[PDB]
Amino acid sequence: GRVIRNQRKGAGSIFTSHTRLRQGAAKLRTLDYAERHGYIRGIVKQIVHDSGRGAPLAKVVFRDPYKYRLREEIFIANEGVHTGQFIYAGKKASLNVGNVLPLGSVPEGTIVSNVEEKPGDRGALARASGNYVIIIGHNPDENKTRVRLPSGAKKVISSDARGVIGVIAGGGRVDKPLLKAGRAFHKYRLKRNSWPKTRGVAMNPVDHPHGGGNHQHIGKASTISRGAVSGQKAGLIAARRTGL
Amino acid sequence: AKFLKAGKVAVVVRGRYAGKKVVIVKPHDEGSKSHPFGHALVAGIERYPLKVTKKHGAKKVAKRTKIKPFIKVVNYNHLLPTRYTLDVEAFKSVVSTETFEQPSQREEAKKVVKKAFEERHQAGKNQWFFSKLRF
């Protein structure tokens, strides 16, 4: 046969992300002396929409500690954050919505978002709209913190990893049906070229492993092992179980 | 209960003197034939003196201590009164309703105000009045 659709996406010719209208990468501040010792105050100048992202973004301006100028940061806004609000980031920050604190400086049960996997990577966890991380325990020895992830997995993270108090704004977006093909078209127009999708059983054998036959059927089990090679991994990959 | 008197220090809010510190000389609570509103006669600073250090020479110190005054009639709503005071008896008489409506008389009055301010700045007192507001 020929190269199947899911193999062609790795070349990245027509499947790259559409990033013309993006506001910029959403990251926390670089962990510096002020963050790890005290705190620094920032001001929210505006809250803006970002193309291809459900959650809104907040523009926060800080003063440069070592030079006379202003530094602008792009944060993912939490619910309740408004323009003109003072934002405090650092070890000695208060427990308020929008403040950036390390996970070792908050009590159990605190709701946080934009959580660093490791101290200094500037946010990796709980970034989509409506998602958050729950603090469930601390290990003062060896400096570890136990957290609960949006998928339900339990992870152990260093207590020096930073997080933003609150929950990502824009929740409830997926509860409204798209209701027609046009709305789906404009949604993926700002993300990437993955829509529409043609079913493999509707193709020819040269095109897809599900293709061909005088009837439209798969013909073999759709559960595919983890050890299969590229060109075979079509269907349900390493499925522990199927059905409703 | 009344604080707008003839020695109160206020901050100008509008009119090419916004952000300049001023002192009230003669207040008029109930209007006048002109300016039918609550207003006061004030004398302020147009150009604050520069900071002086020990390294400056005699000729440079005298140049950096110059003060440019001004006289203005200001509405009450365009003033922000403070808790500071400054006696105006040295130039209370020269600044009045008559010193206006005459280009030549205004210049003579401002020369008297400049002498009082410069002597006030020397032997430093009323330091808050001679410090420019940052905004």
Partner: peptide, 29 residues
């Protein structure tokens, strides 16, 4: 004497910009 004033700078976290210090330890050689 009456023209010069003492205006100490606060070099704490979040205060005035830090002054120039010796950074020879941190130089990228």
């Amino acid at each position: 004497n009456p023209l010069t004033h003492s205006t100490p700078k606060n070099f704490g976290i979040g205060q005035a910009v830090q002054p120039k210090r010796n950074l020879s330890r941190y130089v990228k050689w």
